[PDB]
Amino acid sequence: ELGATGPLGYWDPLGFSTKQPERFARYRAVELKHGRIAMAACTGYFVQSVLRWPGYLSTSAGVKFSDLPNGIAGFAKIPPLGLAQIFLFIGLMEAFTWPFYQGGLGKVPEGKLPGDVAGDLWVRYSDPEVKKHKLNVEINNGRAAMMGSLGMLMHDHILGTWIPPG
Amino acid sequence: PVEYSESLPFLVKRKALKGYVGDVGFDPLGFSEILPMDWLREAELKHCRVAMLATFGFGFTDFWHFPGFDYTTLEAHDACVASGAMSQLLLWIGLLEVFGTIGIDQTLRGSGRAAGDFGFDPLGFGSDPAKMADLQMKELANGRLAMFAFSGFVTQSVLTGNQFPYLFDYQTTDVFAL
Amino acid sequence: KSKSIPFLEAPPALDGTMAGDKGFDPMRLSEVVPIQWAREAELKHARICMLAVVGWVAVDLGFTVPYAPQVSSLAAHDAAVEKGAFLFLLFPIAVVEVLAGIPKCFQIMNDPNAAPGGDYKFDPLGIGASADMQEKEISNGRLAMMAFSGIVTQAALTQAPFPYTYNGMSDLVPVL
Amino acid sequence: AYSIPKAFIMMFCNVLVISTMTIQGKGLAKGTPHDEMVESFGITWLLAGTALGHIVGAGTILGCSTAGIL
Amino acid sequence: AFVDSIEGVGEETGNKIWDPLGISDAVSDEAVMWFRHSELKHGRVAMLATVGYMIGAAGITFPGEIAKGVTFASVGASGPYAAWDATPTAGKLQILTIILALEWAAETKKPHYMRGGVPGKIDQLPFEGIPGLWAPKIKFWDPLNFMGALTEEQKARKRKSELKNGRLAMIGIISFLTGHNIPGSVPALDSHF
Amino acid sequence: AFVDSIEGVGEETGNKIWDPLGISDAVSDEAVMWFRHSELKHGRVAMLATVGYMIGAAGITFPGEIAKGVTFASVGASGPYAAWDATPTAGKLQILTIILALEWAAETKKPHYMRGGVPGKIDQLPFEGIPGLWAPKIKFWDPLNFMGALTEEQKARKRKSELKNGRLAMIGIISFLTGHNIPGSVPALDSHF
Ligand SMILES: CC(=O)O[C@H]1CC(C)(C)C(=C=C/C(C)=C/C=C/C(C)=C/C=C/C=C(C)/C=C/C=C(\C)C(=O)C[C@@]23O[C@]2(C)C[C@@H](O)CC3(C)C)[C@](C)(O)C1
Ligand SMILES: CC(=O)O[C@H]1CC(C)(C)C(=C=C/C(C)=C/C=C/C(C)=C/C=C/C=C(C)/C=C/C=C(\C)C(=O)C[C@@]23O[C@]2(C)C[C@@H](O)CC3(C)C)[C@](C)(O)C1
Ligand SMILES: CC(=O)O[C@H]1CC(C)(C)C(=C=C/C(C)=C/C=C/C(C)=C/C=C/C=C(C)/C=C/C=C(\C)C(=O)C[C@@]23O[C@]2(C)C[C@@H](O)CC3(C)C)[C@](C)(O)C1
Ligand SMILES: CC(=O)O[C@H]1CC(C)(C)C(=C=C/C(C)=C/C=C/C(C)=C/C=C/C=C(C)/C=C/C=C(\C)C(=O)C[C@@]23O[C@]2(C)C[C@@H](O)CC3(C)C)[C@](C)(O)C1
Ligand code: KC2
Ligand code: KC2
Ligand SMILES: CC1=C(C#C/C(C)=C/C=C/C(C)=C/C=C/C=C(C)/C=C/C=C(C)/C=C/[C@@]23O[C@]2(C)C[C@@H](O)CC3(C)C)C(C)(C)C[C@H](O)C1
Ligand SMILES: CC1=C(C#C/C(C)=C/C=C/C(C)=C/C=C/C=C(C)/C=C/C=C(C)/C=C/[C@@]23O[C@]2(C)C[C@@H](O)CC3(C)C)C(C)(C)C[C@H](O)C1
Incomplete structure (x- = not known):
């Protein structure tokens, strides 16, 4: 019942969770994960549009942080060692730091919430109403962020810049 | 029960x-x-009667005129004001209208x-009360038509x-053409 | 809950007696404007826009009265004003408004026993004032309002024939 | 309206006025909920708010145009 | 008046009312009376007009002068359609004047075709009962009283015949007008039209 | 209708529902009805399209002219593909207009396929019952009425064959278009595609 409020209450126009309510926890975990990565990617696009790090991306290569564009071309112009380092960093952070599934697929923690991956050291609201509201805005911002991130990705794929023509 | 106008049935x-x-x-x-309705109706009948006489006189003077008055309808007013034959109408109609204002004063006071009744019926048209209402309605109809008639006469003439x-010159030809 | 907006409560004034009612009044004008006045205005704008749309389309297609300028509807206003015979369309509008809207407006404002807004009892042929024909009137009028807004702002923008689109039927039908 | 900066400035001024205004001691900035404001004042809350929003928007837009910031 | 009660249904459409659109069922009762009177008026006007146009195209014209200086042959020389422009304005003025009189007199009769009168039944002797007006008692319809030698069922048959002829007549007159305006739209119209 | 309340299981897949993704299993029955209706619509459009290219590749055209200013042979001189562009704008506008009318009628029929209706059974007489509209009662499906000679047990078999041929047709039409675009994609296709 978190996720469901707003202009549209429950909104399952194909009845996924209605047909398989046991999988609602898995779907919530996937939605939260996608929303989190989407918020990160959208903030990355907004902040790379304005601010670029000063320094060499790699001494071996001739590429600086300023020469990369902000998009698929920018990600392309990175050394393979740097790309591998990014991939393994994401792998560690998702496998040992924040594993959504305790065990296998469709095995989210029953005791914990579907997207409860933070450890003891995290911001916690000890109030049911405030916790519910903050989680609702979390998931809603995740939805908006991932729709917008798909928009940015398609715009940058087509034109090259995430911002479309005015 | 609510009464609606027969001419504006939405009011x-x-x-x-x-x-x-x-x-x-x-x-x-x-x-x-x-x-008051008495004042308004006296004004209505005065306009009706003056407009009937005016619309007949305009058309008549467009065709025939007395030997002394060799003016057209438009310049007749100015020419006759200069001659002094409009003062002779304003003096002998102003006498009539002095009696008329005494009359409307009396009827508004409830004499x-x-x-608009002056009693002027020499020839006896409508002396029967049955025909008087119909003739009053016909008088009002003809006078209210004559108001627009005289207005059109003057405006279109000028x-x-x-x-x-x-009528414009082009209106005397090909006005029924496909 | 309003039928049109399913996350808001419909106003009490709308109820369901009026024709064209769909519970659509999110910002509740009906409390600050009398519903009869609002309905009279709605029907007046609807009727004017229906006549405007059909006249614009006819003149653009080419239906022209003799002696008038042979121009499109966009320049027809300026052409008629220049040529002179355009105040005589205001004169019947003037008498109709002064002698039917102002008295009817004050009746709606003041009189409790008065005809509803937009009802002039104008039924020469006696086709009927059913609630189907009032709903059809309202729906057609609203569609004509939106259509006239689109027609004018597209014709002024693009300066093209009847479709009022840049490409033509190709924008209405991208398959072309 | 012509310029996207002008539209942004006008929208921001209108939202700021609607948020920070107060009628009879009630306002969003003073912790009165949106639903209570809507029931108490109705569309008079939006009409006055947007009217003063347009006034302050005109003032700031004209000032910025004079200063060359826009 | 009311659609089922009218002598409009014929054997052309399966002995059933022919209203493909939902008009007759959407309009009230008196709108149908108005439509039926209008149908009869259109049918009869076109029924005269088609014969007149045929005669004009054929060139059969009266021997004489329409005015002191104009001939019927002169006004017909420009074909059937331009004859209306060729005829003197002061003559078509009289034609439209008498048509105005006939239409106003027919409309003034009391029962009224929408208020409890037979639709399409133009009242005979339209210029009777009018104060300040005299006209000889020449009936507008059947001045020689041809209807007197007819029975009610025969008269109903002839009313049906009138309607089915008038509808074809309006089809024909619009065919003539469109054939003149758009060339080749209506075949069977040679250069004389 | 449901997971098993709809035909379309064949012996090619061992009489099992071929759903590797499990979509049918996951979504609700309403979405299943939508999917079946879309399946049949795609299969029917594809059975039309595949035989309509095959004729284009063969180069067979109706004798005569499609319009005064362009011929049936002129419009298909560019092989199958480059034919819709070559067709007259008014012609393709009319085709899309009638298709729009059919689609809107089928959607406006009250027993909707999703909301309590048979999926894939678009009404056989569209345009009937629309107020202020008349159309001939030409049955959209089987106007000659070949269905009266078939029993329900035969209709089930024919529906199964419809689905199978339709699926094969949507494979085939994409194969032909892909052969036209990519030359060596699909073998056994000549240069006409
Ligand atoms: C860790 C610890 O100890 O404490 C932490 C704990 C905790 C709880 C994590 C905390 C937090 C909060 C955090 C970190 C929150 C982060 C939130 C984040 C990062 C949220 C992004 C949203 C992006 C969206 C919605 C994008 C929309 C995008 C849209 C609408 C678009 O389509 C974009 C676009 O349309 C535009 C706009 C312009 C148009 O031309 C078109 C395009 C397509 C280009 C604390 C309390 O702070 C501290
Ligand atoms: C339990 C059971 O039985 O089932 C359950 C379990 C199961 C099966 C696992 C499930 C699942 C998973 C599913 C079905 C997931 C589906 C995911 C899906 C459908 C994901 C699309 C992504 C598309 C993207 C990112 C597009 C980018 C597009 C971009 C960046 C482009 O611009 C493309 C481009 O072409 C344009 C637009 C224009 C051109 O000028 C340029 C190019 C060419 C670049 C379900 C649903 O839970 C059901
Ligand atoms: C030697 C000798 O002889 O010298 C003579 C000869 C000579 C030169 C000819 C002379 C002259 C000229 C003169 C005397 C000229 C006189 C001119 C005069 C007296 C001109 C009246 C016009 C009236 C009009 C227009 C009325 C229309 C009225 C209308 C439109 C109606 O019928 C109304 C109507 O309601 C009725 C009444 C009956 C209803 O059923 C029908 C309707 C509703 C339509 C002199 C001065 O005499 C001298
Ligand atoms: C093949 C093709 O494409 O063809 C083309 C070419 C073509 C054919 C030319 C075309 C056309 C035009 C058409 C169809 C024209 C149709 C014209 C039509 C239908 C014309 C009726 C006149 C009726 C009159 C005058 C009735 C008088 C009636 C009178 C005077 C009476 O009262 C007679 C009567 O009182 C008596 C004396 C005695 C009584 O006991 C009996 C009655 C009451 C009865 C088209 C449409 O373009 C098609
Ligand atoms: C995802 C986060 C991340 C982490 C946590 C992380 C940690 C460490 C640690 C500590 C444990 C060391 C000791 C270390 C060392 C180097 N990192 Mg590294 N690194 C990360 C990311 C990237 C990226 C994106 C790039 C990169 C690189 C290099 C180069 C090469 C420099 C050169 O090229 O001269 C060297 C020596 C660049 C590269 O591979 O260049 C070929 C390059 O693009 N790193 N990195
Ligand atoms: C299945 C779809 C379909 C239907 C249901 C349908 C119905 C009717 C009816 C109704 C009874 C009439 C009366 C009619 C009349 C004309 N159709 Mg039409 N038509 C369809 C399809 C096409 C195509 C593909 C073309 C076409 C055309 C023409 C022309 C030529 C005009 C010209 O030569 O200028 C005329 C006169 C061609 C075209 O537009 O040519 C420019 C053309 O290519 N039609 N068509
Ligand atoms: C930041 C950055 C980069 C990046 C990046 C990254 C990692 C981006 C990641 C983006 C990501 C992870 C994007 C997910 C989108 C998911 C969407 C839109 C889901 C929609 C799903 C919808 C609308 C589903 C709807 C329904 O299911 C509902 C709710 C109920 C059902 O009844 C009905 C349906 C099925 C309809 C580059 C490219 C590497 C370089 C660049 O320089 C900088
Ligand atoms: C009915 C009515 C009203 C009214 C009225 C109206 C408007 C009435 C109008 C009456 C009118 C218009 C009456 C004209 C008479 C003209 C005469 C007698 C001309 C004499 C002319 C003479 C004696 C001579 C003319 C000359 O050319 C001669 C022959 C020789 C030339 O050398 C020169 C002279 C100049 C000498 C009221 C009162 C307003 C209200 C009431 O409710 C209803």
């Missing part, structure tokens, strides 16, 4: 026009509520005289510069 009846000839209820702007019909 409520004024209720001040009761017991009058030509009472289709045409009074959207509510003059009867403010001014018994009707709105606008066209043509004598009797008051």
